[PDB]
Amino acid sequence: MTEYKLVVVGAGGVGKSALTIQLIQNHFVDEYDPTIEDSYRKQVVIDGETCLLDILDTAGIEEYSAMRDQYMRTGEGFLCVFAINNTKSFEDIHQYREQIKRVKDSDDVPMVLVGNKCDLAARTVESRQAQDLARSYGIPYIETSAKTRQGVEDAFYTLVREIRQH
């Protein structure tokens, strides 16, 4: 059926893998095992449409980001993730957007800004600050928690809906 290729990017430790695993496997990964390049595939119904989700979980740690560019190149939509208790990861978003622009050779790529770990209280990135960044990119801002599942389905499904507007 219809297939959507999603790519999750962002700094190391922000929760990219936890978000994907929570979405696909319905459980929270408590430990931190750095990712190289992993992919998941699941058939789901989104807004009445039976579709196949191909999700690429990329490395956030530089030393592990070998041919990251090559893997991202096939992506149709990207989830740019930062953690609300990690200001540096938020500032790093700019760099990921530029990378996506390169790999896709386009300035109009489907994207969604995600503020993960919203279950934690050590917030240093206020919602408003992220809303402003997203607005400048012309994309949605959504907060999530791979731990409680809050906003997880909404983030991925919203990305699909952004791809459909492309």
Residues of this chain that interact with Ca ion (CB under 5 A) are: 31, 33
- Write out the two tokens for 11: 């700094």
Known binding residue 117? Answer is yes
Q: Does residue number 146 form part of the binding site for ligand GNP (CB under 6 A)?
A: yes
Among 6, 11, 17, 65, binds Mg ion (CB under 5 A): 17
Residue 12's binding partner out of Mg ion, ligand GNP, Ca ion, none, with CB under 5 to 8 Å set by partner kind:
ligand GNP
Task: Give least dist CB 32 to Ca ion, A.
Answer: 8
Residues 6 or more apart whose Cβ sits within 8 Å of residue 144? 15, 19, 114, 115, 116, 118, 150, 151, 152, 154, 155
Known binding residue 5? Answer is no
Task: Give least dist CB 34 to ligand GNP, A.
Answer: 4
Backbone angles phi, psi at 124, to 5 degrees: -120, -10
Amino acid at 47: D
Residues 6 or more apart whose Cβ sits within 8 Å of residue 59? 12, 34, 35, 36, 37, 65, 66, 68
Q: Which of residues 4-43 bind ligand GNP (CB under 6 A)?
A: 12-18, 29-32, 34-35
Task: Give least dist CB 82 to ligand GNP, A.
Answer: 10
Q: What distance in Å separates the CA atoms of residue 156 and residue 2, rounded to the nearest whole number?
A: 16
Report which DSSP code applies to 62. Answer: G
**Pick 17 or 85: Cβ nearer Mg ion:** 17
Annotated binding-site positions for GTP? 13-18, 29-35, 59-60, 116-119, 145-147
- Residues contributing to the site for ligand GNP (CB under 6 A): 12-18, 29-32, 34-35, 59-61, 116-117, 119-120, 145-147
